[PDB]
């Protein structure tokens, strides 16, 4: 029996929006499925799926030009040049209010699960941001598709992300079908042989490149089956929808 926990109106401030070199905007789904794995390591709750909405989102800067963050001198041997500003490398920022929904199995009491979620939300960061204000989570139980509608409509103000699939490539599909991409996995290229600069020293390392797909932002109360609004790992270094391609 599956259980759901829903956090509403999570204010995140200072999200670095550069998901890839050609996409600047919402953070992709891989961030939100990495967040569930982070919760599984830190707390102990096993999470197999994650859905997410977007109440508000705004990339700071003007319309066609994003703003640049200032840089400070943070390197050994930069004493001579320290009085002058800095070299500047690109990274944009964005501000938004999100809604999160997990899919856990707990098989225990429901009055300690909310406390275990709340002990984690005060610590973690949503894509390098700062969590300012969030509502208290609540536990939802669904059995079949008729009882699943409850957990779907629970989070009413929302804009969930559903899969759409690629026809030939992202450029022609974006021009013709009017869709905007999202990275949903990475393809590895060459193994790093010297692991004295990694942060694990034991895990094998690979150089990788992003691989894209196309998405659609949809009203959550206008989705037939809720399983097309979920995301999970599984495939070769890739994430995918539970309910297939919408």
């Amino acid at each position: 029996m599956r259980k759901f926990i829903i956090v509403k109106n999570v204010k995140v401030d200072g999200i670095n929006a550069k998901s890839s070199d050609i996409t600047v905007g919402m953070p992709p789904a891989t961030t939100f499925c990495g967040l569930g794995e982070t919760m599984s390591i830190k707390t102990g709750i096993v999470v197999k799926a994650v859905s997410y909405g977007s109440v508000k989102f705004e990339v700071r800067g003007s319309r066609f030009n994003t703003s640049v963050t200032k840089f400070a001198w943070q390197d050994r041997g930069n004493g001579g040049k320290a009085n002058n500003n800095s070299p500047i490398q690109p990274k944009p920022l964005a501000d938004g209010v999100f809604t999160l929904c997990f899919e856990v199995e707990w098989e225990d009491c429901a009055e300690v699960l909310v406390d275990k979620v709340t002990n984690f939300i005060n610590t973690a960061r949503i894509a390098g941001g700062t969590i300012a204000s969030f509502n208290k989570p609540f536990v939802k139980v669904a059995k079949d598709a008729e009882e699943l509608a409850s957990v779907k409509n629970a989070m009413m103000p929302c804009y969930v992300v559903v899969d759409c699939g690629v026809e030939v490539n992202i450029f022609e599909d974006a021009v013709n079908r009017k869709l905007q991409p999202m990275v949903n996995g990475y393809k590895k290229l060459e193994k790093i042989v010297d692991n004295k600069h990694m942060r694990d020293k034991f895990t094998p390392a690979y150089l990788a490149t992003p691989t894209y797909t196309m998405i659609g932002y949809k009203m959550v109360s206008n989705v037939d089956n809720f399983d097309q609004a979920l995301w999970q790992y599984g495939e070769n270094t890739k994430v995918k929808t539970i309910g297939g391609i919408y």
Binding site: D95, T130, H197
Partner: protein, 302 residues
């Protein structure tokens, strides 16, 4: 010993502020929290730039943004949160032994002074910078762990002792020494006048329409969070020929003025952090400076 630094060290940010908001209220009734929206005006002036005296008879048309208080209210309200997170000695990258021999050599510092100055920068209203200048009477309200405090007037420049700040400082220093977090919600009330000008943060943008752009969330004026985090880290009074407190930087650099104070005389971070590892005993102030840099965080390349 004779051990050298790794290529990259990385420490997270232990002091997390949020972006503040701006409201217009009254000194009597502080409940009508009306938002302060950002407008757009066009202004006709003269050029008057250095040199180019040939073009000193023409005018230049400039489009800017502005944010003023309405003529019915005379009080500015600033709201934000500040979170202090402990465990300041755990490394993110390049840990090894370099971090352990520094942790065991910096476990006898003075966290009380650092916590007191970190709270007193919030308490004195140093996070305002143009909003503080011109205001008649400021009033700060701090809500930490269902114990509400209120301050009246402090001196920004000098760290004067008082019994109100010491309780919150002792609460913060217990978090920064052990493990855990503490969040405090800060509100600032400023008495300016009917129809005065408030000052949000200005963008580093290349827009072709506006000469000046202000930061806003859904139209309402606001300040950047990384802008606000600079005032908390203004505790550095231990550099050579110290006159005014500066921000905590590894080289002690103020690029706005164009000078670097701490760098160039074997007093910066990358000399003291090697001397502390290699057995040399430090003074009470440059033991605090390194720890203040760790609380600030950052990466450190080779």
């Amino acid at each position: 010993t004779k051990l050298k630094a790794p290529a990259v060290l990385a420490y997270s940010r232990k002091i997390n502020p949020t972006n503040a908001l701006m409201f217009a209220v009254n000194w009597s009734d502080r409940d009508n929290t009306t938002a302060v929206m950002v407008g757009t005006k066009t202004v006709a002036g003269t050029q008057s730039v250095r040199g180019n005296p040939n073009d000193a008879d023409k005018g230049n048309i400039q489009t800017v943004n502005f944010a003023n208080l309405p003529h019915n209210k005379n009080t500015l309200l600033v709201k934000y949160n500040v979170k202090f997170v402990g465990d300041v000695f755990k490394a993110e990258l390049g840990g090894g032994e370099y971090s352990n021999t520094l942790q065991t050599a910096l476990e006898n510092t003075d966290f009380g002074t650092l916590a007191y100055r970190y709270v007193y920068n919030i308490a004195a209203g140093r996070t305002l910078w143009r909003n503080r200048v011109g205001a008649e009477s400021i009033e700060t309200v701090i809500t930490v762990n269902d114990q509400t405090f209120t301050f009246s007037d402090l001196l920004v420049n000098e760290f004067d002792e008082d019994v109100d700040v010491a309780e919150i400082a002792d609460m913060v220093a217990g978090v920064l020494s052990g493990e855990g977090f503490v969040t405090l919600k800060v509100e600032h009330y400023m008495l300016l006048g009917e129809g005065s000008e408030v000052f949000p943060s200005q963008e580093f943008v290349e827009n072709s329409k506006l000469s000046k752009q202000l930061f806003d969330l859904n139209g309402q004026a606001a300040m950047h969070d990384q802008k606000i985090g600079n005032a908390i880290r203004t505790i550095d009074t231990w550099y050579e020929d110290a006159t005014t407190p500066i921000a905590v930087e590894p080289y002690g650099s103020v690029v706005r003025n164009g000078v670097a104070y701490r760098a160039g005389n074997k007093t910066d971070l990358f000399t003291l952090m090697d001397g502390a590892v290699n057995g040399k005993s430090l003074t009470e102030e440059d033991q605090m400076f390194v720890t203040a840099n760790l609380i600030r965080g950052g990466v450190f390349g080779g």
